[PDB]
Enzyme design. Structure first.
Site, short mmCIF file in Angstrom:
data_model
loop_
_atom_site.label_atom_id
_atom_site.label_comp_id
_atom_site.label_asym_id
_atom_site.label_seq_id
_atom_site.Cartn_x
_atom_site.Cartn_y
_atom_site.Cartn_z
N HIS A 153 0.80 -1.22 0.00
CA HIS A 153 0.00 0.00 0.00
C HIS A 153 0.83 1.27 0.00
O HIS A 153 2.04 1.24 0.23
CB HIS A 153 -0.99 0.01 1.17
CG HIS A 153 -0.36 0.11 2.51
ND1 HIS A 153 0.14 1.31 3.02
CD2 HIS A 153 -0.14 -0.80 3.49
CE1 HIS A 153 0.63 1.11 4.21
NE2 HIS A 153 0.47 -0.17 4.53
N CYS A 176 3.54 -4.62 6.73
CA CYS A 176 3.07 -4.34 5.39
C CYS A 176 4.19 -3.89 4.46
O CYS A 176 5.24 -3.44 4.91
CB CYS A 176 1.97 -3.28 5.41
SG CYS A 176 0.42 -3.87 6.08
C1 LIG Z 1 0.52 -3.87 7.86
O1 LIG Z 1 1.67 -3.29 8.39
C2 LIG Z 1 -0.42 -4.40 8.92
C3 LIG Z 1 0.35 -5.20 9.98
N1 LIG Z 1 1.24 -6.20 9.38
C4 LIG Z 1 1.17 -7.38 10.12
C5 LIG Z 1 2.00 -8.65 9.75
O2 LIG Z 1 2.92 -8.52 8.90
O3 LIG Z 1 1.68 -9.70 10.36
C6 LIG Z 1 0.23 -7.33 11.28
S1 LIG Z 1 1.14 -6.99 12.87
C7 LIG Z 1 0.49 -8.19 14.11
C8 LIG Z 1 1.27 -8.13 15.43
N2 LIG Z 1 1.32 -9.52 15.87
C9 LIG Z 1 1.46 -10.39 14.72
C10 LIG Z 1 0.82 -11.77 14.89
O4 LIG Z 1 -0.10 -11.96 15.67
N3 LIG Z 1 1.31 -12.84 14.10
C11 LIG Z 1 0.71 -14.18 14.23
C12 LIG Z 1 2.40 -12.70 13.14
C13 LIG Z 1 0.71 -9.62 13.60
C14 LIG Z 1 -0.60 -6.10 10.91
C15 LIG Z 1 -1.82 -6.55 10.12
C16 LIG Z 1 -1.30 -3.31 9.53
C17 LIG Z 1 -0.49 -2.32 10.37
O5 LIG Z 1 -1.90 -2.64 8.44
#
Ligand SMILES: *C(=O)[C@@H]([C@@H]1N=C(C(=O)O)[C@@H](S[C@@H]2CN[C@@H](C(=O)N(C)C)C2)[C@@H]1C)[C@@H](C)O
Length: 268
Positions: A196, A214
């Site tokens: 994005h 992301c």
């Molecule tokens: C994009 O930056 C989104 C952001 N990116 C991620 C990702 O790459 O997983 C998630 S962060 C979340 C924190 N704990 C992680 C988890 O539970 N696992 C199992 C990896 C994920 C989030 C969607 C967002 C900021 O737009």
């Protein structure tokens, strides 16, 4: 044609993707998602007839109790036609649950589009049928919140979307929490990874990782991705300090090794 009597609370409807007549990328699995949990996976698979032309070996794998996927061992050959007959009407799908109707879709595979996001160069390179058409600086997840490596299937796209940490159980009012307006967002995982627009990290794109996971790119590059990349195209992330995207994510199907996928997870 035989009528199937039913009884309230004992019916499940199948929903098939991709759409009838759609052109999709080389990574698009056939998906059949039911509106109820399926106890007899074997019965469901037996009722689903997938045929391909040119013909390729494919197999079913269940991501969860609701959704089964079918794909070949390798990415589809462009031009392939796929026919899906979900013949579940009246089928006993286990535990008193019966298929409510049949569904029949057909789709085709478009150009091979594979975008590689290399954490070492911080460049996202888009290749169509082998030729580089685009090189975009990117900023991926910081060391504490890294982008997972692996093969991601391109899903939905949004001109605008809200990233709200509260849907992840994190209050907006607590650093690690956020409510972000985002332009030109292409979904690449159910877990919430997108390519994005991120004007706030343009300085870091091509140089350092500053995101939550992301793939941050410029507004113009994100719009380009939105415009030119379609459902079923592939994004491969390589060289990050993260692990690998889960195979059962929803868009992580290709991370499951073929021998495991082929063996399936319906009872013998
Ligand atoms: C994009 O930056 C989104 C952001 N990116 C991620 C990702 O790459 O997983 C998630 S962060 C979340 C924190 N704990 C992680 C988890 O539970 N696992 C199992 C990896 C994920 C989030 C969607 C967002 C900021 O737009």
């Amino acid at each position: 044609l035989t009528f199937q009597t039913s009884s309230p609370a004992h019916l499940t409807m199948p929903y098939v993707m991709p759409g009838d007549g759609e052109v999709v990328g080389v990574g698009e699995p056939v998906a059949i998602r039911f509106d109820e949990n399926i106890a007899d996976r074997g019965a469901a698979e037996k009722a689903i007839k997938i045929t391909t032309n040119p013909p390729v070996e494919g197999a079913f794998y269940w991501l969860n109790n609701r959704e089964v996927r079918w794909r070949p061992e390798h990415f589809w050959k462009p031009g392939t036609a796929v026919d899906v007959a979900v013949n579940t009407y009246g089928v006993d799908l286990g535990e008193g649950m019966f298929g409510e109707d049949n569904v029949q879709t057909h789709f085709t595979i478009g150009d091979e589009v594979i975008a590689t996001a290399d954490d070492n160069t911080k460049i996202l390179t888009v290749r169509v049928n082998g030729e580089v058409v685009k090189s975009m600086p990117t900023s991926m997840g910081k060391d504490s919140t890294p982008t997972a490596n692996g093969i991601y299937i391109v899903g939905s796209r949004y001109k605008h979307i809200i990233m709200d940490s509260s849907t992840y159980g994190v209050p907006v009012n607590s650093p690690n929490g956020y409510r972000t307006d985002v332009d030109w967002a292409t979904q690449i995982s159910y877990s919430g990874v997108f390519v994005h627009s991120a004007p706030w990290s343009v300085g870091a794109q091509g140089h350092t990782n500053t995101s939550h996971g992301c793939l941050n790119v410029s507004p113009s590059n994100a719009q380009w991705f939105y415009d030119h990349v379609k459902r079923g195209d592939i994004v491969e992330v390589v060289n990050t300090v993260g692990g690998t995207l889960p195979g059962i994510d929803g868009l992580g199907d290709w991370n499951i090794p073929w021998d495991q996928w082929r063996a399936g997870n319906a009872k013998a």
